[PDB]
Subunit: 386 residues, 2 copies
């Protein structure tokens, strides 16, 4: 209750963000609402500690090993991106080659690496035969899989078959589907991957941060060497992991997926096209190649109606990368608010109504009022500070 | 607080145990402190959900400009260490030379203190004239006197060097005009936001040069809005008259401590202090700094061993201890307490193997600590 009295300007900014989170429909596939108990840990007196291993870090590691079903965890990475870079820094030599995904049909981090891409077929699925052919030619030291805008499951087993044929390490970046992995609602990356990286936020609903997992003791030792401990953040990760182990979190992961199925079905019944024909996870991609509006146009129109999505290039893209021909839409945040099939059906029909009359501003403003009323039936938080 | 107490008793117990630890021992490590409660409230806010330049970042920057009396601020560094590194990365090229106090390949050179414990500025000038460093760094974590930023800029100007002032260890004294200011002498200034500023764990880089500011911004460029808000909250607290009183108390408690120790005939590096810390000198005593560290720790007084000028023992053993007043001053302790503490420190040092005495002192100081609670809750 201090800020309410001691810092009017910060309190106003927090309160307006709290109101914004509560009153609009967050459908950016990477966004989510952290658990209240995670924020309590983030705001705890553990921030004063330390300006061989704290019990709190051992507990975070123990819970991670159980949650991710692996023998070793490092919980010190500040982000999923730092987690990936620490893996490269630990396992690669200068000018080693990295083969990773992009959604199409030289780089430094202290050390210089050579970067290569594989992609999707014209139907929007990873082309594993072509990824193998690229690997055979490129001969990468490490193959990475996992991708922020892919609406289907990663076949880690097949990627390991490729990695084994060319003698590559395999890194599974599960940052974008982690809450589905740890609830057995997405194919598991182990034992196929030599090493796995993830964020702790997004579909896991923990604090902002990264993590690195492995079953190989020598990889684990190298990771520990390549990576100031923030004890409140490590505690917050541990808090999130214990929430993630509960049966309620499996029910949440199933709702994330079923809400996506409801949304996909509603859109396809209104004759909208989806990349790959639908989804098997937390996100879909709408396909506007044959529409007179762009992904950017749709992003803005839906945003005016209180629905946040993001534009996204799609396979066969014919528009510029700043404009794009698609939008990415996710269910994780609204599912965390308790919204379900009835709500996702209404949202699908409203998205269809706007895309079918995309410059009708009064329609957008009408929809915004209706969906704000829906949001207020499913409040996110009863307070802005925990 | 509520949720964790019900939903995760194991983590809640660990928080409570650490809350008791903070309250029950006398924290005198010069770099430790207790963050403002309002800063932890920002840290535990819903701002963590934003973005998986914001008005929150602009407010943090504007408050930093006012607080540090400068034209530009970058508030993104995650630590004092990252802040220094970003300065080097932004302003230096490989094999450039860095003169500081004792794929980039920066080459490091050192100046030191005379045997009286003061920075030797004549020798630092001689070294700079010969080596011609591209950058000079000043500020130091175990130095009990004020940095002469003006003299360092005279040296840097002689050789055409940049001057970085690392104020991480004295920042709360600087911004209250209780320590010489680094500007306009320094081209660039780095600091932590915790320690004597009592904000969150984090870093900051300040400058008055637009070109340097542009390079800093490119060099450090995931924004953690709860952390940036927390820095902003701390800076506003640092601007209050209450915070200048706190800085004066930090310094006056250190004077009380040094006076008490010297009057019991203990020796101090440079004979005293002008800031938040002192160094005790055990070169002529049969016990080591490690001995003193352990013995005082067993009495509930937390210090750290530290090498001193003329060190003759192993660097893992040392002939001194570093003692600071910032954390106990933040709990509200004053001269009466620091006189008692100085006396008990003396009693233990004069009988360093009396373990019964250490345990007896620990119980005695428990009542004093209980009089000055750090906080009234473990979660904000």
């Amino acid at each position: 209750y201090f800020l309410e009295q001691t810092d009017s300007e910060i309190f106003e900014l927090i309160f307006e963000e709290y109101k914004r989170q509560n009153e609009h429909l967050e459908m950016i596939a990477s966004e989510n609402y952290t658990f209240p108990s995670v924020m309590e840990a983030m705001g705890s007196i553990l921030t004063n500690k330390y300006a061989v291993v704290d019990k709190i870090e051992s507990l975070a590691i123990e819970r991670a090993k159980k949650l991710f079903n692996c023998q070793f965890a490092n919980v010190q990475a500040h982000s999923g991106s730092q987690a990936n870079n620490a893996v490269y820094h630990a396992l690669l030599k200068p000018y080693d080659k990295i083969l990773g995904m992009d959604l199409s049909c030289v780089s430094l981090t202290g050390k210089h690496y050579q970067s290569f891409s594989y992609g999707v077929n014209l139907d929007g699925y990873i082309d594993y035969e072509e990824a193998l052919k690229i690997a055979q030619s490129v001969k990468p030291e490490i193959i990475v899989c996992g991708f922020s805008a892919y609406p289907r499951e990663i076949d880690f087993k097949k990627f390991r078959e490729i990695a084994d044929e060319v003698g590559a390490l395999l890194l599974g970046d599960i940052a974008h589907v982690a809450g589905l992995v740890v609830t057995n609602e997405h194919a598991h990356p182990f034992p196929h991957c030599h090493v796995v990286s993830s964020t702790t936020h997004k579909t896991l609903r923990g604090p902002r941060g990264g993590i690195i997992l492995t079953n190989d003791e020598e990889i684990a030792a190298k990771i520990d060497k390549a990576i100031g401990p923030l004890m409140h953040v490590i505690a917050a990760k541990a808090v999130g992991f214990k929430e993630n182990l509960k049966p309620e979190f499996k029910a949440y992961a199933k709702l994330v997926k079923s809400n996506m199925q409801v949304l996909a079905k509603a859109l396809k019944e209104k004759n909208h096209k989806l990349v790959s024909g639908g989804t098997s996870n937390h996100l879909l991609l709408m396909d506007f190649l044959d529409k007179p509006y762009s992904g950017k146009d749709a992003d803005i129109a839906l945003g005016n109606a209180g629905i946040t999505v993001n534009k996204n290039t799609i396979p066969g893209e014919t528009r510029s990368p700043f404009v794009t021909s698609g939008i990415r839409i996710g269910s994780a945040a609204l599912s965390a608010r308790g919204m379900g099939a009835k709500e996702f059906e209404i949202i699908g029909n409203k998205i269809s109504d706007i895309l079918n009359d995309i410059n009708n501003v009064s329609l957008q403003l009408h929809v915004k009022e209706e969906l704000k009323a829906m949001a207020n039936q499913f409040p996110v938080y009863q307070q802005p500070i925990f």
